[PDB]
């Protein structure tokens, strides 16, 4: 799931702050 996985990357974007 490409959209799935990029949803995680999106989460990691705020999750990293």
Instruction: Indicate the burial class of 10 (C-beta count within 10 angstroms; 0-12, 13-18, 19 or more).
Output: exposed
Round to whole Å and give the CA distance between 2 and 14: 19
Round to whole Å and give the CA distance between 16 and 2: 20
Q: How was this structure determined?
A: NMR
């Amino acid at each position: 799931g490409i959209l799935d996985i990029k949803n995680k990357v999106s989460n990691l974007f705020k999750k990293i702050k």
